[PDB]
Amino acid sequence: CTTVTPAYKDNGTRSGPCVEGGPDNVAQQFYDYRILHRSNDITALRPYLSDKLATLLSDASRDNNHRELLTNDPFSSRTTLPDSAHVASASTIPNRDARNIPLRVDLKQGDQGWQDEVLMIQEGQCWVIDDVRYLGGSVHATAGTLRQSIEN
Amino acid sequence: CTTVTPAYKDNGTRSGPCVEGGPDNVAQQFYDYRILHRSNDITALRPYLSDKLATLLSDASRDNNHRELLTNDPFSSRTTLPDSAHVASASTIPNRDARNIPLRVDLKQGDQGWQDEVLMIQEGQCWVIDDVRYLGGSVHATAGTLRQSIEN
Amino acid sequence: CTTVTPAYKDNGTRSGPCVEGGPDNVAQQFYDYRILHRSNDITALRPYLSDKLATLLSDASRDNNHRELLTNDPFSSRTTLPDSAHVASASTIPNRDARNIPLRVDLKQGDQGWQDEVLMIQEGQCWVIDDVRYLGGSVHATAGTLRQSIEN
Amino acid sequence: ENLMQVYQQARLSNPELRKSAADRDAAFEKINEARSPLLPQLGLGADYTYSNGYRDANGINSNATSASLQLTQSIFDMSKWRALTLQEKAAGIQDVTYQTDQQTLILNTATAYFNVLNAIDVLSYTQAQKEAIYRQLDQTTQRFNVGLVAITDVQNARAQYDTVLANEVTARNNLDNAVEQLRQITGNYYPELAALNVENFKTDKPQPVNALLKEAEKRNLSLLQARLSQDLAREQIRQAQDGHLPTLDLTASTGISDTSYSGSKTRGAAGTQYDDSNMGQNKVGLSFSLPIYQGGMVNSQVKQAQYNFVGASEQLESAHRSVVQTVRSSFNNINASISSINAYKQAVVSAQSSLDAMEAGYSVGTRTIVDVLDATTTLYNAKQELANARYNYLINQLNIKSALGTLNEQDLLALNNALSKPVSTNPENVAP
Amino acid sequence: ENLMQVYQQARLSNPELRKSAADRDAAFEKINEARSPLLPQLGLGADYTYSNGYRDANGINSNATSASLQLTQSIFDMSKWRALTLQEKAAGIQDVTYQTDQQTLILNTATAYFNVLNAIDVLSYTQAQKEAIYRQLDQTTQRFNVGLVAITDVQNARAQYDTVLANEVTARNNLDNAVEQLRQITGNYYPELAALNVENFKTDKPQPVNALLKEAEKRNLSLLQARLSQDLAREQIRQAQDGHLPTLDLTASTGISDTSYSGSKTRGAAGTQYDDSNMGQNKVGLSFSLPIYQGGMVNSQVKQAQYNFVGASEQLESAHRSVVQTVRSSFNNINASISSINAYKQAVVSAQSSLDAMEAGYSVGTRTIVDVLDATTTLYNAKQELANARYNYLINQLNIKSALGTLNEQDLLALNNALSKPVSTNPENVAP
Amino acid sequence: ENLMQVYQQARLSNPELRKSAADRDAAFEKINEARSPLLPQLGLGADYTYSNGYRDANGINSNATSASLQLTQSIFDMSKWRALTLQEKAAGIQDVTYQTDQQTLILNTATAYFNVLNAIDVLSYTQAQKEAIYRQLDQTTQRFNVGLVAITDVQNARAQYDTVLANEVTARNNLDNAVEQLRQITGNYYPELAALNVENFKTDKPQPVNALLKEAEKRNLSLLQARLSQDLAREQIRQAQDGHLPTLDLTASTGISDTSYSGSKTRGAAGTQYDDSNMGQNKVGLSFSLPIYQGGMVNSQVKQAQYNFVGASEQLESAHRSVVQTVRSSFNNINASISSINAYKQAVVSAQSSLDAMEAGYSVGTRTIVDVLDATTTLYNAKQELANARYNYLINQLNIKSALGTLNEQDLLALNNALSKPVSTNPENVAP
């Protein structure tokens, strides 16, 4: 009984499509799509990034300044595509009064680990990837997180 | 055992008479006297107000500026005398080291309620009314509580 | 199990000799040595003071300004040698991550008590008396604790 | 973006507000934990006990395997209901503090957004002063190169120019810090914001402090929180006794037990009490308890609750006094701001006239370059102070609206209706 | 009213001091709750159990109604005594912090009173400056109307007049804020307060910092609180083990039970074990318990208490160092104030002489109006600084007395002996 | 001594660092208490019960002496392991906050040490200004005694001298307060400290804000603490349920009981069940428990833990934003400091040239003494600001190094390599 009834009749305005939901679920699905395929290009990855990282990556690609960073790997701390990923668990999310969940994903390769971190944003009834904190040794290129790295 | 022995050998200087004691008791007695009788004039109400609200109301009456505020009702939030009152309970007061206790009284009329608030001041071995916080919709006149309402 | 492993590989630089250890132990030993003998001169008291109170007392003696204070009693709040002392207990001290511990000693005489206070400095594998806070009525001379009393 | 879009983005992605909301939801869900002990408590339990004999019980070995299913209910216990009511009141005060947090967020974002604009205005005014002093320096230097006056004027003007340059560096640093702080509180980097136009800036006198005090006392958030805390203390003293009220419980249980005996002495001729027993029993019962002399614990707890209630009442009185102080201070601050706006406008006009007069006198020759430089710095200081007074008046209006206890996005809309032109906050672009 | 009446009204009607006193009284009454478990614990309990049977116990139903009256006492348990001593120490530290709160209240009320007086003085000085500049304006304007000098002087003096007007507005706002703050800290609206006279204001050199430091170390409240906290940590570590000491309890119980049997199988020919039983037992017994191997819990608790005691001793040493810093700072600040009083008196006399000289030079024609206006500004600034230094010296004297640890109403009386003339704090009356 | 020795003495004898280290050690030792309940729990207990008959038990007396030795183990209970992991995470976050405390100590001691030097420089500059104004006073007074100019110059210069004297008193007090604060933070009285030489003071541009942000994000202490707190919240929600998992215990017990009967009715002809019984029994057994319907308590606890985990994640995000703000602010402040150093060097050179020009003009007669006094005070203000900017730049370099998260004694060594000459901080010695 005594339902929570959250006081947030907001947190919407989502444009593009996405997966069903669940933070660990969507992060794991996005990583699995990246490893299983070999493209990792933004056009195929559009559903998992909602409305701001997609446009930022688009204009960074059209900028012809960050070609190396945007062509080797923009989402992993290295220059090589990982071999396996394990997202930190989170036992679902109560109601909808929750946003900006940072999750650390153990990004494991053959006898190696980097343990990156990624922010996650709700945008309505869904969950989407954001930031990617670039938390690990031997940072790929530029510096900081992806959003600060490609920010003009 | 281990009596409290309060460190307050002060809080005296009482001039006029009053009722035995008990904050809820004196508030209930005051409201019952005002409801039962129809005069509500200050001269008959001297024991219940302490030493300052009495003289403040006396000089406001002699000022001939707040006649409209002072003639209908100064102590209720409305312009009409209430029909019943119910003061919030308080399980007596330990020793004497307690002053300025504000109590909220439910002022109930025919299918209506306003739930005003009144300050309680000790001045020695007794209890007396102060301020009256005017906590209710559609206040009588002027604004705020009575003390700022009649203050020059 | 789960040894604490304190994170301080420091707090050394000990010059003179000293007693085995234990704050209450060294305080009791110092007071017992002062009481049993009658000299109380700093030359024989060198082990119980560390490196700074010793040299401060030496240069105060060579200064010839605080002759009365240094000749009556430097460590007791009175001008007369006490009759018995009882140092506040302390159940040893875990590891070494602990320094500058103050203890209050009851300085009991015939139908009298002053209960002075003395600081303790570890500075190695040992414990040493410092400061002496002169916490008692009818202070001997100068003012405050001994260190700032003889400070220039 | 203007103030509305900045605030909307700040509210959509603020961490502290989200944390306060999560805390409120947790305190709201605590009601189920509080209500749990009143509901039936059902459990299961099985065990197996092996007993070996000793002393006079030599040669006796027993093996007992048991299972049980129990159910318990509290028929009459006022302590649980009082705990539930306490949890309800705690949830209420948490809701109130969440509302206060929301108001604080609105006030903070508005303050930061206007601080950025104030820094931009300060930097622009300082740069204009530097340009004017540079023009004066160039004129004096060219006059000396032709040759009309000694070297003192050049030295004084260039010293003033250096001081103004240092002030400009400081102002640029302050602007950069302010814009970064706005990004931090909002979560986005804004290249340009709506500025404040002077044509449509019209002031309005506030309501009399009487009605202000009435509405503030009726609808303030801090006062409501204090009242709820005092009511919580009253329910705490009501609950604190819980010792003079007898408790009543109802229990039910279904149990099975299988006991077997073995040993050297168990093989005797008795054959009656040393055989396997298979007992299946279901019990229904009631339990009645009543403390009578608790050693004075309940009386001491009650008196402690009385003292706590007195303390809560004192805290509520202090909160009311602080609310009155806040309302009066906000009203006086608005009145000071509206007076100072006109005062600084007149001061700026008079200072410009004075600078023109000093320039004319220097042209005649009755003054000196230090005097005209002082007039210029006074004029620019007056303009800077006028701009700061405007930006402080807006914030003061928002502050009094918040202290009244009825601040929402409509007030932000009223403020935002006065912003028309956009200006960029890039340090390099404004001063190339 | 003067300072004594203000302080008395503040003490008699302050909510924060009342809250601190209520908290102290509650912590004092905690002693009875701590002492309750050592006293006899008496209780009553009755129950009724219905039992149905199956399996090998088929056809057996029992009804058992029982009542009992129990009494328990703790013959030997050092943990309770240690808890009582801990509660005693907590009550002591609460009394100490209540005394500190009293000192803080007296310091705050004195500070607010003298802040109001300083605001009045600043406003009056600014008004006098405005009057002087207005007189200069009128003289220069009439001279130009007759016609002797150019228009530059009028413009410059008008700019100065406008700036002074803005300063006057802000000073009036500050005074109103200060008087409202005093009303908030006291609870009454004071129309007039005793001012400060300059004839009877005589300064006294403070005691040497040595005896000051001695008395402060002996009698400071914060240091005493730290010492009590360290003693509390010592008693906590003494209580920490409580696991190597065996416990001893004494119990008594008067109980009645009535058991009745019924069922299909209970109507057999036995007639011995299946009849109604009425048992009555009054039992007196002793219980002895002794932990031997607690799994290392007691040792870990003792070591944690040792670390906590070390931390408490470190906190006490930090408190002593802060006390020494406070005493030294107070002494140095008092000496600075007493020197600055004389410095500013000499400065204001020199500034008045300089203003007279500049006026004479302007009459001759050597100087200009900007110079005499600057001299006027300097003179009035010096007067304001002197008044502020006086009030700061008085507040500083109270501050050092408080840091000594022996501050009471006698120091308030000593301060109040210097206030003679009453002045009204109404903005309208002081600004006709 | 220089900065290295001051820091070493501060680290060796600081009370607050000792307290933080003791708290961390206590949190580390809490692991043993958390691990205790998993280990075997062994105990002993003996009792003596006397029973007197009543009702149908009239004439029945019993005396029972019992002893028992018990041992309990928890075969399977995930709650204990989860509590152990929670204690582990708490110890980790305590270690992190201890490291942050170390960083804070280093920053604080450096700030105080440089504040002392800044105060010394300010006092020396003010004293030099006083000497220059005194020289001007003496020259003007002697010229008037011979007789060349009116008294206006004497009056104005005397007023300036008095104001400068007041400022000197204030600066001396500030220096004394600063040196006492340094002694408080260190624990020793330092007569002289290493000063700052201007020959070897060479500035260096910082690393680009990108790599700064990268390293700060990877290795900040506050962000690491936030991550550890979020992990702790995750383990808390993992532990939260602990209700759906059945528990299993193993018990053993060696017991002896001696029962003796006596009474008027106990002397009957039965002689079978009314004799002394000496029973010894050693028992081993297993207990299995499983909650099935807890009334919704476990579900509510799990949901509350989910809300708490959401709140912890949001607090982590807020900490990350604060880290970004700190890094950006530190970089901008460093750049402002390095720019302002050059700006103030140019300004002071310009002011010296301007003062020389004004003195030459006064010698010619075009200027007045107020102008040269203004030039002098502008020069000394510029010098004071330059020194303050230098010290602020050094402190800001340490600040950005600390915010990066890799501050240690090597940075203090780098700072100390720039300190060469020793200067005494005695107020009387510097200004006899």
Author numbering:
A (entry chain P3), B (entry chain P2), C (entry chain P1): 19 to 170
D (entry chain C2), E (entry chain C1), F (entry chain C3): 23 to 454
The article reads:
Tripartite efflux pumps are essential for Gram-negative bacteria to expel a wide range of toxic compounds, including antibiotics, across their dual-membrane cell envelope. Among these systems, the AcrAB–TolC complex of *Escherichia coli* is one of the most thoroughly studied. Structural analysis reveals that YbjP, a previously uncharacterized lipoprotein, binds TolC in a 3:3 stoichiometry, bridging its protomers at the equatorial domain.
Native purification of *Escherichia coli* membranes yielded a stable assembly containing the outer-membrane channel TolC. Cryo-EM analysis resolved the complex at 3.56 Å resolution ([Fig figs1], [Table tbls1]). The inward-bending HTH coiled-coils occlude the periplasmic tunnel, maintaining TolC in a closed conformation—consistent with previous crystal structures ([Fig fig1]). YbjP features a globular domain and a structured N-terminal loop stabilized by a Cys36-Cys144 disulfide bond ([Fig fig1]). The N-terminal density extends to Cys19, which corresponds to the predicted signal peptide cleavage site, positioning the lipoprotein at the periplasmic face of the outer membrane. In the closed state, a complex network of interprotomer hydrogen bonds stabilizes the structure by constricting the pore to its narrowest point at Asp396 ([Fig fig3],[Fig fig3]). In the closed conformation, the coiled-coil helices bundle tightly, leaving a ∼4 Å diameter sealed pore.
